[PDB]
Amino acid sequence: PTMVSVIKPEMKMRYYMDGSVNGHEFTVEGEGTGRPYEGKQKITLDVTKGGPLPFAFDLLSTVFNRALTKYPDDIPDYFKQCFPGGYSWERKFEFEDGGLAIAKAEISLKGNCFEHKSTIEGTFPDSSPIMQNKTLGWEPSTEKMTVRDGSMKGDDASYLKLVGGGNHKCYFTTTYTAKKKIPNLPGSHFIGHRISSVVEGTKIKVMEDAIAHLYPFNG
Amino acid sequence: PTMVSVIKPEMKMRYYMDGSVNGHEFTVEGEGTGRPYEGKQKITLDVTKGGPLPFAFDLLSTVFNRALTKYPDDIPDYFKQCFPGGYSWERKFEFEDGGLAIAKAEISLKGNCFEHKSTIEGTFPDSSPIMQNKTLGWEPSTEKMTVRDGSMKGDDASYLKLVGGGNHKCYFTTTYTAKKKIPNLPGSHFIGHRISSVVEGTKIKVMEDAIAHLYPFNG
């Protein structure tokens, strides 16, 4: 598949996030380790301001890097090609009850460590399961990837698990943009995700697995 | 996988559609043959009123039956369980330029033939590639399937191919409802689609392949 000399089989990550949800400001910091070509990553975070968070961590989990995606040989990997140079992205979250959030992230590479800086602003009705901190994780999803003006566009009809077995829809609309022109742009494809988070007080553990594909017809 | 005695390996289909786009009324009729358990189908249609259609047939292709989906052994097939009894669905189409359409369909089974009756209403800016009849088919997609109140919900971030290589986004939001309570409801999953249409004057040929799955993590 796409291979880049600065993207190593094992890499480290550092995170810093500032955010505000319904006026509640907070800060989260942490680190992690990832296997870029395997599309796997483990992250450990600490809420350093505004903790314990009064809302569901599920709102933040996907904000804490598509370079950590396993790409097959037949689909160009836009994200690994973003290095060296770095890239940024902005994601809009549209919840079924009108809740709305916008997160932005800048990802750079210092040595063998991804430096991830992000912010998020959100507004929700008090009745939202996000505000009541009662969602139980994101279901595995499929993000649709397309290209426009040299940037990757991702659309994901995401769903949060609820007490009692129901679900809560949240559309993700993301734009990923390399700082430098990417020479090998991919055709449209999919990325299958699986993310899990576990919150213990102000400490959180996150794991994401992501694999790009064109299943079941493979183009 | 899910097996139903009235859903045979080879089945026939009959279609009737009445619609109106930007005030232009039209009627389409046709027939087809499908392999329900293989998730394959072939359809031949004729525009019997309002033809040749002044807009892109891509707007109608997905309106002309989820019972024609290959389901794996580990995911209950809601759609085949809709028979006998029948089911209906309503799909909202939200185009990136503000174009909007709503299609409704009723699917019943008479003998070994699916009777498909549908309607569609659409409103588009004159500049839309749909109104200018210049889209070049839907890219293969992944529809997210969930369950709510005994009905299936489907979300698909669909894209139309354009002259010059670009794309045009259209969100599909669909609700599929069996006339009778479905006893074996599936968990959330995906359905991978591939549809193609060829228009020759007032005659159109459509082919769809659809496979339900949980790739790449398979639950």
Side-chain angles (χ1 to χ4, degrees):
Chain A
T2 295
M3 292 174 288
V4 179
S5 88
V6 298
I7 299 300
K8 309 187 185 313
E10 294 179 48
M11 292 179 74
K12 296 177 72 64
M13 294 92 83
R14 224 64 175 293
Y15 305 84
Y16 183 92
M17 172 191 281
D18 273 327
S20 185
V21 177
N22 275 19
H24 180 73
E25 295 187 313
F26 61 94
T27 301
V28 184
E29 302 176 55
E31 60 188 306
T33 60
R35 297 173 122 55
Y37 299 101
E38 299 186 15
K40 299 176 178 55
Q41 64 182 284
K42 294 181 184 177
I43 302 172
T44 51
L45 303 161
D46 283 289
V47 186
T48 60
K49 178 172 61 65
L53 302 171
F55 56 82
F57 186 76
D58 289 325
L59 174 63
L60 312 179
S61 64
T62 74
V63 180
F64 290 108
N65 178 356
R66 283 278 59 75
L68 304 169
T69 307
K70 172 177 187 60
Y71 265 78
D73 300 330
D74 64 318
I75 306 176
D77 189 335
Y78 178 103
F79 307 101
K80 285 181 186 61
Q81 294 181 69
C82 286
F83 301 91
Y87 76 107
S88 68
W89 61 253
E90 176 172 288
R91 178 171 301 145
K92 176 174 60 181
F93 295 84
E94 291 170 301
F95 296 88
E96 62 170 58
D97 66 350
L100 179 68
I102 295 182
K104 311 175 177 181
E106 298 175 300
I107 302 167
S108 53
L109 184 170
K110 173 94 295 182
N112 195 45
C113 179
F114 285 113
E115 187 72 6
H116 191 287
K117 307 175 192 175
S118 69
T119 60
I120 183 172
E121 280 210 298
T123 301
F124 295 83
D126 298 330
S127 59
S128 163
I130 289 293
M131 290 315 300
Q132 290 183 0
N133 188 16
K134 61 183 189 179
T135 52
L136 309 170
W138 296 102
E139 297 185 336
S141 73
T142 299
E143 185 175 7
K144 169 68 185 203
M145 312 302 308
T146 56
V147 176
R148 190 171 294 166
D149 294 320
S151 291
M152 293 307 302
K153 297 286 191 179
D155 304 298
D156 197 325
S158 304
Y159 279 86
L160 293 148
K161 288 169 285 184
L162 308 174
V163 175
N167 57 70
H168 190 260
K169 182 172 63 181
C170 178
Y171 292 105
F172 291 179
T173 304
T174 316
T175 296
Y176 308 87
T177 302
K179 188 194 76 168
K180 297 185 172 63
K181 179 176 176 295
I182 296 303
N184 301 308
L185 294 172
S188 301
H189 58 280
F190 310 123
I191 290 179
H193 300 272
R194 180 181 66 195
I195 189 169
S196 64
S197 299
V198 179
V199 181
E200 179 61 13
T202 54
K203 299 192 73 177
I204 310 101
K205 294 179 184 175
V206 178
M207 294 190 275
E208 191 210 6
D209 284 282
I211 302 176
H213 67 80
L214 285 165
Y215 194 84
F217 306 109
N218 314 305
Chain B
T2 295
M3 292 174 288
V4 179
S5 88
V6 298
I7 299 300
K8 309 187 185 313
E10 294 179 48
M11 292 179 74
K12 296 177 72 64
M13 294 92 83
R14 224 64 175 293
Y15 305 84
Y16 183 92
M17 172 191 281
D18 273 327
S20 185
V21 177
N22 275 19
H24 180 73
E25 295 187 313
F26 61 94
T27 301
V28 184
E29 302 176 55
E31 60 188 306
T33 60
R35 297 173 122 55
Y37 299 101
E38 299 186 15
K40 299 176 178 55
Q41 64 182 284
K42 294 181 184 177
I43 302 172
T44 51
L45 303 161
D46 283 289
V47 186
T48 60
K49 178 172 61 65
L53 302 171
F55 56 82
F57 186 76
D58 289 325
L59 174 63
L60 312 179
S61 64
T62 74
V63 180
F64 290 108
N65 178 356
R66 283 278 59 75
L68 304 169
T69 307
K70 172 177 187 60
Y71 265 78
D73 300 330
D74 64 318
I75 306 176
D77 189 335
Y78 178 103
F79 307 101
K80 285 181 186 61
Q81 294 181 69
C82 286
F83 301 91
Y87 76 107
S88 68
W89 61 253
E90 176 172 288
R91 178 171 301 145
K92 176 174 60 181
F93 295 84
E94 291 170 301
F95 296 88
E96 62 170 58
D97 66 350
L100 179 68
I102 295 182
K104 311 175 177 181
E106 298 175 300
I107 302 167
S108 53
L109 184 170
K110 173 94 295 182
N112 195 45
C113 179
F114 285 113
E115 187 72 6
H116 191 287
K117 307 175 192 175
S118 69
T119 60
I120 183 172
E121 280 210 298
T123 301
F124 295 83
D126 298 330
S127 59
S128 163
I130 289 293
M131 290 315 300
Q132 290 183 0
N133 188 16
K134 61 183 189 179
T135 52
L136 309 170
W138 296 102
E139 297 185 336
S141 73
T142 299
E143 185 175 7
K144 169 68 185 203
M145 312 302 308
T146 56
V147 176
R148 190 171 294 166
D149 294 320
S151 291
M152 293 307 302
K153 297 286 191 179
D155 304 298
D156 197 325
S158 304
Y159 279 86
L160 293 148
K161 288 169 285 184
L162 308 174
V163 175
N167 57 70
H168 190 260
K169 182 172 63 181
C170 178
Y171 292 105
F172 291 179
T173 304
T174 316
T175 296
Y176 308 87
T177 302
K179 188 194 76 168
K180 297 185 172 63
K181 179 176 176 295
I182 296 303
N184 301 308
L185 294 172
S188 301
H189 58 280
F190 310 123
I191 290 179
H193 300 272
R194 180 181 66 195
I195 189 169
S196 64
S197 299
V198 179
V199 181
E200 179 61 13
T202 54
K203 299 192 73 177
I204 310 101
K205 294 179 184 175
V206 178
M207 294 190 275
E208 191 210 6
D209 284 282
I211 302 176
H213 67 80
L214 285 165
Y215 194 84
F217 306 109
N218 314 305

